[PDB]
Amino acid sequence: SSRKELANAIRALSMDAVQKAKSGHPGAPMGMADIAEVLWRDFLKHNPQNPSWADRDRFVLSNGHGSMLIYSLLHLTGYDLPMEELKNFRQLHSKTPGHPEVGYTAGVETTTGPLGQGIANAVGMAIAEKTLAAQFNRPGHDIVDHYTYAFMGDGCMMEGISHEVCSLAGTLKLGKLIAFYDDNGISIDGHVEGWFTDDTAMRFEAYGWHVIRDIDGHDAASIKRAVEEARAVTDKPSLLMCKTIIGFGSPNKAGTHDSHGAPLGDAEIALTREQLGWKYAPFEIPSEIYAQWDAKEAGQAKESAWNEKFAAYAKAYPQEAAEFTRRMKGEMPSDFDAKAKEFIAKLQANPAKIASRKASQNAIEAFGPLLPEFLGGSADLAPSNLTLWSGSKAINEDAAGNYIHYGVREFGMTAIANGISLHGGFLPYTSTFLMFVEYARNAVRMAALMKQRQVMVYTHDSIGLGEDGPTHQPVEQVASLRVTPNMSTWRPCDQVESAVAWKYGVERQDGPTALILSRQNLAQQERTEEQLANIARGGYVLKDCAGQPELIFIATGSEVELAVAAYEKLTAEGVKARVVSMPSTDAFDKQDAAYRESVLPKAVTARVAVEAGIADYWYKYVGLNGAIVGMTTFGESAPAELLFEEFGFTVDNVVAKAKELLHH
Amino acid sequence: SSRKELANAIRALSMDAVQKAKSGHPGAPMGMADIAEVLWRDFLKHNPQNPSWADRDRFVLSNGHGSMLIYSLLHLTGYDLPMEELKNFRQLHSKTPGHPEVGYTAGVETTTGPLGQGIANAVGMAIAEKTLAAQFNRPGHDIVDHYTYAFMGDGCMMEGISHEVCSLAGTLKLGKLIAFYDDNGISIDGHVEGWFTDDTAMRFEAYGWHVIRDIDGHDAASIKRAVEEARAVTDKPSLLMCKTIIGFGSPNKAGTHDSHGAPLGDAEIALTREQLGWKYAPFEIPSEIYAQWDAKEAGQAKESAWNEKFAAYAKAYPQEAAEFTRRMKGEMPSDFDAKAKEFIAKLQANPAKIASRKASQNAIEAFGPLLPEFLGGSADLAPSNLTLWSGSKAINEDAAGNYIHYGVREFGMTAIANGISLHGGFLPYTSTFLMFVEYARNAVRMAALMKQRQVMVYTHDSIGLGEDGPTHQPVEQVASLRVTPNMSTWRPCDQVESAVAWKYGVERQDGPTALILSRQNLAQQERTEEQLANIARGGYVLKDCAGQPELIFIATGSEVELAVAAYEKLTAEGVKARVVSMPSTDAFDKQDAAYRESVLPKAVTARVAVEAGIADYWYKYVGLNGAIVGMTTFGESAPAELLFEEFGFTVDNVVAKAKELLHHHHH
Ligand SMILES: COc1ncc(C[n+]2csc(CCOP(=O)(O)OP(=O)(O)O)c2C)c(N)n1
Ligand SMILES: COc1ncc(C[n+]2csc(CCOP(=O)(O)OP(=O)(O)O)c2C)c(N)n1
Ligand SMILES: O=C(CO)[C@@H](O)[C@H](O)COP(=O)(O)O
Ligand SMILES: O=C(CO)[C@@H](O)[C@H](O)COP(=O)(O)O
Ligand SMILES: [Ca+2]
Ligand SMILES: [Ca+2]
Ligand code: NA
Ligand code: NA
C-alpha cells in the first residue's frame, strides 16, 4: 500500500471510533496521520510485545485530545489493544479513554489532556535518558540510547509551561528530544491569528533549539527528510514546524474549528471516505495494511539485540548492571529500610531544634549515598529550600549528576519530574516555597493521578516565615493537598518526624508525597519506642493522661510545641488532656479502625485542632462540637513571633479555646 | 545634584531600611535605581497628591521583592508615605510590607511578589487603557492617554506566565506598554547561565515586541534615549534590556547572589556609602534632594490640565462623561439592581431545564446591555464556556470592543484580568473549564488578596461532563476555592440560582466570585418569594417538614435534584426530612448565627451532604455523625449518566445512605 493509504487507516479508525462514541476529537488525528506514519514506521524504536523495554524510544502525545491517533497507532503496530477496544472508545472501563492514560493501555507513556504537560513530560523523559546514559554507559557498552518524540499543537505552544520546559531543554542541550508542532492554524475559538501570532520558530531558536520550518505535514518525503535532519543534530533539541490541515480528508470540515472536538457526522464521513479513496467499512482493516504497520517482528529483533548488549554489559560491569535493573524496576535497595530506621532512631536519641527545611536537607544527606537514583532539584531556591547535599552534582555541570537547577519554573519543574518518574531509573524530588505549589498545582495532581513517585519538598509553610508577608505565607494550600486523591502530605513537627516523612515518600510505590516544611526552628519532642514507631502511622498519641481523655489537642508541624504547652497547663490544673501529633492525615486515615480509635476515641468530642493553616479543614477531625485554632484570613508582613501572637497561636488563646470548649 | 546622586537616594533608603528591618532585598533596588530615577523624574505622568487620578501612567514592579525601590520612589516624589513608614519596613501594620500591596500604600498599583504576575497585571492595565481610549476618546477629546511601565527581572522572564502575557501583548499591539528587564545575570541559585540561557531579545522579537538591547542600566543618558525610542514606537510593546549590577555600590556584594535577599550588613553599608559618595545618615535626605525629586508641582499641573480637558469633554459629551466617571469609580448603574431582580423573578416564574453554563450565558446576555463596563473573555473556550453574547465584540477586531480571546493562557488570562480590575473602568470576567483553575490558581488567590471584583466563569464542573475523563473532571477544585480567604464560590443548582450568583458577583466590590457551572442540564426547583430571596444568603431551606427534621440533606449544584428526589421518597415513607440548597458556603458562613441555626439547627445531627466533589470538605457542615455522598477518587472516561451511577449519585443510593445513617442514630 502507499504511505498515504497507510496513514489513511489512522484517519478511518479515528473518525469512525469518534462517530461510534458520539464523542471525541477527529481533527488532530486526521491532521497528524501522515506525520505519525513516517515517525512510527520509519524511525520509532519500540517493541509492541514489551511496552516496558528499558531502552525503547518514548513517544508523547501532548495534544492528548487527539487520543484516537495513539490508539490507532498502538492497534495497527501490534500492541495488545484489539479492535473491540477501539469500538469502545470513551466507554466505561475501556482501554481507550477519551484522553490517553498511562497504565490503562499498552504503550501509552503518560497521561495527557491538560495542555502543555505532555511536552513537559517529554522534556523530563529526555533528561532522564541523557542522565541515565551518562551514569551507566561505558566504553564499548552504550546500554542507554533512545529518543524522545513529542507531538504538540497550538494549545501546548500558547501555554506558559511550554516556555518553561523548552527554555530549560535548550540549556540542557537535549539532542534526542524531537518535537513535532501541528501547525494547523485552528483552535477552539477559530482561526488562531486573533489570539496567537508568535513567530514560533524564532521563539524556539531563542531557546537554543534546532528548528525546521515549513514542513509539508501531508507529504511523507518532506516529513522524512526533516526527521533525518533532526536526528543528525545531536547538541540541540529539534522542533519540526509541520503545516497540517486539521480534519484532513473531510471536504466540508477540514481546516475548520468544527473538526476539532465533535463527531464529523455520518454523511461527512462518507464524503471523507470518498475524498481519501478509503474503501473499507468502519473497523475494517485489510491484511496488507496490517502487514505494513505491524512492528512485532522488528520490535522483538531490536529488543533481543538490546538484551544481548545488556548481557555483555553485565559481564563487564556486574554491579552497574544490577543497579540498572533495580533502578529501572523502581525497587528500593534491600538495606534501605534498616539504614533509614537507624538514622531515625539516632535523631530521636540526639535531639536538635532546627527548622524542618534543615531536617529535610539532613535526610537528603543521609539518604543520598543509599539512593543513587535521586534526581533532585529546586526552582531557583537551593539555598532556601535546602535541596543540596554533599553529593549533589548539577547535571548542567556533569551529565552523570543527580541535581537539576530548574530555574524559576515551578510548573515546568513538576511536570518534568513527572516525566522523570515515568521514564524509570530515577526517584525525582522537586522543591519550591509551599505557596508556589499553586503555580504547579495541576502537575502535582497529575503525579497523583498517574500514581507516580515524586517527593515534593515545600518549605516556608506558614506565617512562621515572617516578613515576606501574605503573598508568600501559605494558609489554605495544605488543606487542598490533603483532599487530593492519592496524594500523601506530611507536616512534620521536628527533625524526627521529618526523616520519617522523607522515608515514607521515597518508599511510596504508587504516588507522590508532599513535605510541608518550616523556615523557623522546631523543637524536638520526646518519644517512647512505640511513639517513634507510630510516626509512620500519620497520627499518634504524643502526650497522654491516665484513662479516657476529657480533652484532645490535635496538632501538626510547628504547632505541636504550642499544643504541648497548652496540654501542660491544663494537665497541671487536673484536666485529663491528650496531645495527638498528626503529621499525615492520609497515613492516619489508612490505619485500622482500632488504631484510629486509640488515638481519637469516638466518645471524646472535646477536640481542639491547632495548625497555622486554614481552619475549615479540621472539621474532618473535630466535628461540630470541637474547636479549631487556625487561620481564617491571609497573613501579614511582620516578624514571625509577632504574627503568631497576632493570629492567636499563643498558649493563652489555645488554653482559652480549650476551656471554653470544656465549659460547653 | 547629579542624576547619580539622586538615584543614590534610592540606594541609601533601600539598604538602610532593609538593614533596620534585618530582613529584605537590597540587591534589585540598588541595581535598578538609575533606571527608576530616569523613568520617574523624566517621563512618568503622575500626581502624588491624587494617586487615583484616572489618566495617570501606571507603574508596576513585577520583581516585587525589590519593594524598597517603590517605597523610596513614592516617598521621594511626595506621596503620603512618611519616612517613619520606611523605618517600619516589614513591621506589623506598616504601610511598607515586605512585598508591595495595593491598598496599603499610596501609589502602589498592584500587589506583587509572586514572580511573573506583575508583568501580567501590567499587560492588563495596558489592555484597559487601550480599550478605554477606544471606547471614550472623541475627535478633539483624547481623555484617555497614558502609559504602562513595568520593571521585571530574570525570575519573571523564566516564569511561563511571562510567555502567555507577552505573547498576547504582541498580538494586541500594546504600544503604550514599556517594560524594563533588569538583566543582571544573577538569581538565587547564583549565575543564571546554569539554568537560563535564552536569547531573550530574540524571544521578545518573536512575540512582536520592539526590543532595545544592551542598555547600560547605570547610565542615565542611555536609559533616557531608550525610553524616548520606546515611546516613539506606537504599534508594539517595548522591552528595554537593561544591563545592571545587582547591589550596585557595594564593593563586596555587588554582582553577587548574596545581595539578593539579605541585609548587606552594617560594615558593608559603610563601605557602600563610601563607594557611592553618599554622606547622609540612615533615613536622612536633605531639602535640596527632596526639591529635585518632588513631583507635587508638576503632578498638580498635569492633573489640572487633564481636569480641564475632561470638563471640555463633559460639555461636548455629557452622557459619555457621566459613564466614564461611573465606570472609573466602579459604581453600578442605578437601575441595575431592579432590572437584575426582574430577570431573576422571570426565570423563577418560567422554568427551563438547561445547563448552568447556558444559564450563565443567558445572564451575560441579560446583563450585557446594562454593563458596558464588562471586559470578558475565555481561554480558547468561548463555544464551550458560553462566554459570548449577542453584543460581544472582540478587541482584536475592534479596539472599542468588550471581549478578549485570551488563547490557551489560563494563568495569564486571570492575572491580566487582575490588571484590568485594578486599572478601573471595567468589570472583567474570565473563563475556562473548572479543572484548569489549577493552571491559574495563584492569580485567583491574588484577586482575593487584592480585594478585586472579577467574575470567574468555570464550566464543566464535575463527572457530569462525561467522556473527557479524569484529567478534566473536577473533584477537589471547588473545595480548594471554598477555603480560600475572601473568595466567593457559587455552585448554582438551576438557572435561577445561576442568575442570582451572577448578580452577586457583579455587585461584589471587594473580592472575586467564581461560578461553578455544569455541562449537563439542571432541573429548576420551585421557590416561594422568600426562598427566591434567600438564594443570595448562600444556604437556604428548599424543602422542609413540620417539626424538627430527623434528617437534613445539604446539596449543591447538579446534586440538588438528586437530594430533592431522595427527600420526596423518604417523606412519602413518613420520614421528617429537610433539603438545604447550599450554592455558596462563603455567603452562608457570612450570615449571622441566628440565620445559620434556622437552616442547619444544632439539634439535628443526622445530616447528609450530596455533591459530586471531594467528600472530605463536607465534614464542616455534617460533622462526625452524618453521611456524605461525594467523590473520594478521580473520575473516569465514560458517558456522564453512567459515571453518576458508578459513583453512587442515584436516588437509591442516597436513600439507602440516609436510612443507614438513621439506623445508626437509632441504635
Ligand atoms: C489548561 O489546559 C487545558 N486548557 C484547555 C483545554 C481544552 N482544549 C483542548 S485543545 C484546545 C485548544 C486547541 O489545541 P490544539 O492543540 O490547537 O488542537 P487542535 O484543535 O487539534 O488543532 C483547548 C482549549 C485543555 N485540554 N487543556
Ligand atoms: C512562583 O513565584 C515565585 N517563586 C519563587 C520566588 C522566590 N524568588 C524571588 S526572586 C527569585 C529569583 C530571582 O529573581 P530576579 O528578579 O532575578 O531577582 P534579583 O535576584 O533581584 O536579580 C526567586 C526564586 C517568588 N518570589 N515567586
Ligand atoms: O526572594 C525570596 C522569597 O521570594 C527570598 O530571598 C526570601 O525573601 C528570603 O529567603 P530565606 O531567608 O527565607 O531563605
Ligand atoms: O477539547 C475540549 C476539552 O479539552 C473540548 O473539545 C471538549 O472535549 C468538548 O467540548 P464540550 O462539548 O464539552 O463543550
Ligand atoms: Ca491547532
Ligand atoms: Ca536577576
Ligand atoms: Na537530534
Ligand atoms: Na511605545
UniProtKB/Swiss-Prot annotation, chain A:
Biological process according to GO: pentose-phosphate shunt; pentose-phosphate shunt, non-oxidative branch
GO function term, MF aspect, one: protein homodimerization activity
Binding site for substrate: 25, 260, 357, 384, 460, 468, 472, 519
Named cofactor requirement(s): Mg(2+); Ca(2+); Mn(2+); Co(2+)
EC number: 2.2.1.1
Annotated residues for binding of Mg(2+): 154, 184, 186
Modified residues (N6-acetyllysine): 45
Keywords carried by this UniProt record: Acetylation, Calcium, Magnesium, Metal-binding, Thiamine pyrophosphate, Transferase
Catalytic activity line of the entry: D-sedoheptulose 7-phosphate + D-glyceraldehyde 3-phosphate = aldehydo-D-ribose 5-phosphate + D-xylulose 5-phosphate
SUPFAM superfamilies per record: Thiamin diphosphate-binding fold (THDP-binding), TK C-terminal domain-like
Active site (record annotation): 410 (proton donor)
Annotated positions binding thiamine diphosphate: 65, 113-115, 155, 184, 260, 436
Enzyme class: transferase
Subunit and interaction comment: Homodimer.
Protein's job: Catalyzes the transfer of a two-carbon ketol group from a ketose donor to an aldose acceptor, via a covalent intermediate with the cofactor thiamine pyrophosphate. Thus, catalyzes the reversible transfer of a two-carbon ketol group from sedoheptulose-7-phosphate to glyceraldehyde-3-phosphate, producing xylulose-5-phosphate and ribose-5-phosphate.
Name of protein: Transketolase 1
Organism field: Escherichia coli (strain K12)
Lineage: Bacteria, Pseudomonadati, Pseudomonadota, Gammaproteobacteria, Enterobacterales
